[PDB]
Ligand binder design. Structure first.
Ligand code: HEM
Ligand SMILES: [Xe]
Ligand SMILES: [Xe]
Ligand SMILES: [Xe]
Ligand SMILES: [Xe]
Length: 148
């Protein structure tokens, strides 16, 4: 699958500095959808501003978790069946924490933003399409967690 190799090659670049890259993703996310900020409630407190989130080790750990789940998806690009059940429960978990399935569209745009910014000219039309398909497949599996 040529799509899979474009994903593998672009991810190599990102995966070298995952927290730095995931930081861009989350900064962009809160800039687009500020109402996601209160959902991260560590030690029973909510973050007042997006910059507060960046000072939180728990929040930064969650960036690492996100980048790890993406890494699993890239590893399993040719077949996400090994990941379907895990991703369904991951959706269920995010439903429980208060995330609306609708917000995963903004997450997608934030992912594509991070990739465009990191890769520059190497973020070709084909690369963008490949990532949009992989992300779509991930969200499809996660969406099963929202009761159906
Ligand atoms: C809309 C954006 C998101 C929000 C508001 C959100 C919120 C949360 C919260 C509150 C937790 C529990 C606290 C914690 O573990 O730090 C969590 C856990 C987690 N998140 Fe997210 N999340 C988002 C997106 C994602 C995405 C897209 C992924 C996958 C690529 C992801 C991967 C994970 C993982 C692996 C955990 C640990 C779940 C567990 O095993 O308990 N997160 N998230
Ligand atoms: Xe952020
Ligand atoms: Xe963790
Ligand atoms: Xe993501
Ligand atoms: Xe993804």
């Amino acid at each position: 699958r040529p799509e899979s190799e474009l994903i593998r090659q672009s991810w190599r670049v990102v995966s070298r500095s995952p927290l730095e890259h995931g930081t861009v993703l989350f900064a962009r996310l809160f800039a687009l959808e500020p109402s996601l900020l209160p959902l991260f409630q560590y030690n029973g407190r909510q973050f007042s501003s997006p910059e507060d989130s960046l000072s939180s080790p728990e929040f930064l750990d969650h960036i690492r978790k996100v980048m790890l789940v993406i890494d699993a998806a890239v590893t399993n690009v040719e077949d996400l069946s090994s990941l379907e059940e895990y991703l369904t429960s991951l959706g269920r978990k995010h439903r429980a924490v208060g995330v609306r399935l609708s917000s995963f569209s903004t997450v997608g745009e934030s992912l594509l933003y991070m990739l465009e910014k990191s890769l520059g000219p190497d973020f070709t039309p084909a690369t963008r399409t490949a990532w949009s398909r992989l992300y779509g497949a991930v969200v499809q599996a996660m969406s099963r967690g929202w009761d159906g």
